[PDB]
Every structure is written in structure tokens, then in C-alpha cells.
Structure 1
Amino acid sequence: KTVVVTTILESPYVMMKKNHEMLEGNERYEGYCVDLAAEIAKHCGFKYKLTIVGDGKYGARDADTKIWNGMVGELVYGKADIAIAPLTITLVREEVIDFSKPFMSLGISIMIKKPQKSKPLTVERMVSPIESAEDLSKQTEIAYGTLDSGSTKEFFRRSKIAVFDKMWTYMRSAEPSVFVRTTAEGVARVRKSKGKYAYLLESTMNEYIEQRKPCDTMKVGGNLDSKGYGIATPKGSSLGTPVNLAVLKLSEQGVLDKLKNKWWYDKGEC
């Protein structure tokens, strides 16, 4: 009996092949997450089928309806068996599912449109109107928004730090809506907003987007926090311990570092 692997279309984790039209099965997808699933299968023997979540969401719990959507909702209600996807370990998620030891470290960063070079001996330098989250909160001419129904939005919602509280107070009562439905939508808003918008996303996707063409976006300031991505399984399932030791073994062998290097920096340009 094969298990269901639920994923989310996000680069470079789960991308779509340019020649996927006539391909059927797990061979249509490629990226970091498919390689991680292959290595997990190699360590502990099992057959898997890759599925993309229906709603295209990472997972969130409704305030009143009190149900989980996205991959978390898929795992809790039994529609899937394991989620090999960039799912962030959070306090609320751990109370409903089981998270393995993180296979990648990350943080909350800022994405802004890369500013024009400063002409004024004859050296060329770059200036940025945003240098950190504090000065981002202090100003008003540059708006900022996050990805809806994600770990970052919930972190900003429950944050008790004064600067993050101010940022959340702005975001929750901003017209027009500053949130986006997908990471690609947020990046597109950044690129088309002539520098009048800043995107708060995970540092891994931030670096990935910065490295590729048209290389017109850059990351400013340090990581707002330190989190990770875990492989999630439903509470009490028998697939938790095997994938835990699988992740540990992959970390010890150095396969994870090689995968990060070959999917993130090896394909860079600009």
C-alpha cells in the first residue's frame, strides 16, 4: 500500500518540467523536494506518489470555522500521509501534526526592488531606502505585505515585539490589501510596484529569487528570526520515526548540503 505525498508548487522545491506534457507520474516534477522524497524512499523502503495540494496553501486554521486548509489540513484530516514540502515548523502546527528534525534552516527576510546605482572618485555605489525592519515600520511611503495563509502571517499576527506589533497593526488595517495569494504573486507585485512595495518571505526563496534573472530584486537586512522546514506526518502515524532517522542520516552524510548547493547556487546567474 503506497502513501500519499502532498507538496506545494514552489521553486526550487517543486517545479514543473518544460517537457512534462507527455510525462505521467512522479517524473513530471523536479526540484529540491522531489530529490528529498527520493532520498527518503532510498533510506526507508516505500513507494510514494507526488500530489500538489488543491488549494495551493501551506496551511492555516480559521479563527471561527476552526479547520485547517492547505497541506496541514490535508495531513490532519487524512487526505495525505506525509508532506515533503517547505513547511515551516510552528508552535500551532506541532500541536496537530508531527514534525521531524528540520532539513533546512531559514528566516524571515525582506524583498525590495533593487535600487538604481548612484553615479556620484568615479566610484559607483548603491543606496536603499530600507535598511532594517525597524526603519521599514517607521516609514509610511513604502507599503509591505506577506503571503496569505502561511507561517509568516501567523508569526506577525501573534508577535509581541513592539516593531512587529506595529507592522502587524499596519498590515491588518491596510487598504488596498497588501497580502498576496502566492509567492510568485508577491514577487510580481514587488517588480511591478516601482519600488513602492516590500515583500516579507522566507530567506531561502528570497536568495533564490535574487540569484536568478532578471536579477532586479534584493534582500535587505538580516533574518528577522530563525526557523526551519520539517517533514510532517499525522499525529501517531508510524512513518514519523523512519523519516526522522532518514533526515538525520541524510544530514550526517552531507547529502542535504550537496542538494542545497546544486539546487540553489549552482543554477545562479547575474
Structure 2
Amino acid sequence: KTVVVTTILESPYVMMKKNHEMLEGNERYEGYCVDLAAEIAKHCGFKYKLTIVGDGKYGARDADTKIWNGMVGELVYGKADIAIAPLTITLVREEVIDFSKPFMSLGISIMIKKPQKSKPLTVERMVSPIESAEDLSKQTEIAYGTLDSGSTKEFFRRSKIAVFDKMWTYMRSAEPSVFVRTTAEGVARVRKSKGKYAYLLESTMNEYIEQRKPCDTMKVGGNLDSKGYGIATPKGSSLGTPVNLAVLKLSEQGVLDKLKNKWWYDKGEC
């Protein structure tokens, strides 16, 4: 019996092939996550068919209803059996599903439009309004926001640190709304905001976008915390230990580093 692997349409984890109007099956998508699924199936024998969640959300908890949605939400309800997707490992998700050991290090970073080149002897220097989260919280002339129903929204929602509390208090009463449904929408907002917008996203997508054309955006500051990407699995499933072992095996041989280099730096430019 074949199992369904749920994934989110995000780059460079899963991208649409140029020739995909006629292709069918698992050959429709390319990226990091499809390679990870291929290696998982090579380490342990099973037939997998990738799918994309209709909602398109990573997964969070709704208010006053306590119903899980998104990738995690449909993984709890049994319509999916494994989520090989860039899903962060969180305490709220750890109490409802089983998470394998992280296969990708990440952190909340700062995304800003690349500032222009200051002419002043003829050397070329780079300056940026934002160099840390503290100064972004202090300043107000540049707006900032996160991705709706993601992991960073939950991180700022339940943070007792003073600076993160200030950022969250600014975010909840932001007029107009600052959150974005997709990473691409937030990136486009940074692109067309004339430097009047800061994006809070995971470091992996941030560096991939920085090293991709037209590369007019760059990351400043530092990682606000340390988290990881894990392979989801429903509670009481016979796949958690094999997938955990497979991730450990891939880490030991170094396949994960090879895929990261191939899909992050090998296709870079500028």
C-alpha cells in the first residue's frame, strides 16, 4: 500500500518543473524536498506520491475553535501520513504529532531591500538602517511583519523577551495588516516597498532569495533563535523511527549537505 506525502509549494524545497503541463506523478516537481523524499524511499521501501495542501498553509491553531489546519492540520486528521516539507519543529506541534530529528538548521532573520551604493576615497561601502532586531523595534519608519499562520507568528505570539514583546505588540495593532499569506507575497512587498518594509522569515528561504536573481534583497542582523525542519508523522504511526533513522543516516553520509549546496549555491548568480 502506497502512502501520501504532503508538501507545500515553496521554493527551493518544491518548485514546478518547466515541462509540467504534460508530466504526471512524482516527476511534476523538483527541489530539495523531492530529493529528500527520494532518499527516504531509497533508505526504506515504500511507494510515495507527493501532494500539495489545498489551503497552502504550514499549519497553526485557530482561535476559540481549537481546530488544526494547514499541513499539520490535515496530517492530524489522517488524510496524510508523512510531511516531507520545510515544517519547523515547535512545542505546540510536538504535542499532536511526532517530529523526526531536524534535517535543516534555520532561524528567524531580517529581510530588507538592498540599500544603494554610497559613492564616498573611491572605495564603495555598504550601509543599512537595520542591523539587529533591537533597532528595528526601536525604529518605526520601516514597517515589519511575519507570515500568517506560520512558525514565526507563533514565536512572537508567545515570547516573554522585552524586544520580541514590543515587536508583537506593534504587529497585532498594525494598520493596515502587515502579515502575508505566502513567502512570495512578502518578498514582493519588500521588492516594491522602496525599502519601507522589513520581512521576518526563516533563514533558509532568506539566503536562497538573496542568492537568486535579481538579488536586490539581502539579510542583515542575526538569527533571532535556533530551530529546525523536521519530517512530520501522525501519533502512533509505524513510520517515525524508520524516518528518524533515515534522516540520521543521510546526515551521517552527508547527502543533506549535498542537496543544500545543489539547490542553494550551485544555482546561484550575481
* TM score, norm. by length of structure 2: 0.99
1:210 aligns with 210
Deviation (angstroms), 1:113: 0.3
User: What percentage of aligned pairs have identical amino acids?
Assistant: 100
Separation of aligned partners in 2, 1:182 and 1:69: 16
Aligned partners of 1:169, 1:189: CA distance in 2, in Å? 21
Q: Where in structure 1 do 4 or more consecutive aligned residues deviate above 6 Å? A: none
Following TM superposition, by how much is the alpha carbon of 1:74 offset from its aligned partner in structure 2, in angstroms? 1.0
Aligned counterparts of 1:101 and 1:124: Cα–Cα separation in 2: 44
Q: CA deviation at 1:122?
A: 1.0
- CA deviations over 1:183-215 (Å, ceiling 9, x no partner): 000000000000000000000000000000111
Aligned partner of 1:180 in structure 2 is: 180
Instruction: For residue 59 of structure 1, report the CA deviation from its aligned partner.
Output: 0.2
Residue segments in structure 1 that go unaligned for 5+ positions in a row? none
Deviations along 1:198-248, whole A, 9 cap, x unmatched?
000000000000000111000011100000000000001001011010001
- How far apart are 1:124 and its partner, in Å? 1.1
Q: Aligned with 1:233: secondary structure?
A: strand
Map Cα deviations across residues 93-131 of structure 1 (whole Å, 9 max, x no partner): 000000000001010001000000101111111110111
Q: Secondary structure of 2:83's partner?
A: coil
Write the mapping of 1:43-192 to structure 2, written as runs, cut at 5 A: 43-192=43-192
Which whole-Å CA distance do the structure 1 matches of 2:189 and 2:65 have between them? Answer: 30
Q: CA deviation at 1:162?
A: 0.2
Indicate the residue corresponding to 1:246 in structure 2: 246
Equivalent-residue separation in structure 2 for 1:107 and 1:162 (angstroms):
19
Q: Please, what is the CA RMSD of the aligned residues?
A: 0.5
Deviation string 1:25-55 (CA, Å, 9 cap, x unpaired) is: 1001000000000000000000001000110
- CA distance in structure 1 between the partners assigned to 2:221 and 2:90 by the alignment: 23
- Please give the alpha-carbon distance, in whole angstroms, between the structure 2 residues aligned to 1:66 and 1:79: 19
CA distance in 2, matches of 1:74, 1:6: 9
- What is the count of residue pairs matched by the alignment? 270
Shift of 1:63: 2.0
Residue 258 of structure 1 deviates from its aligned partner by 0.7
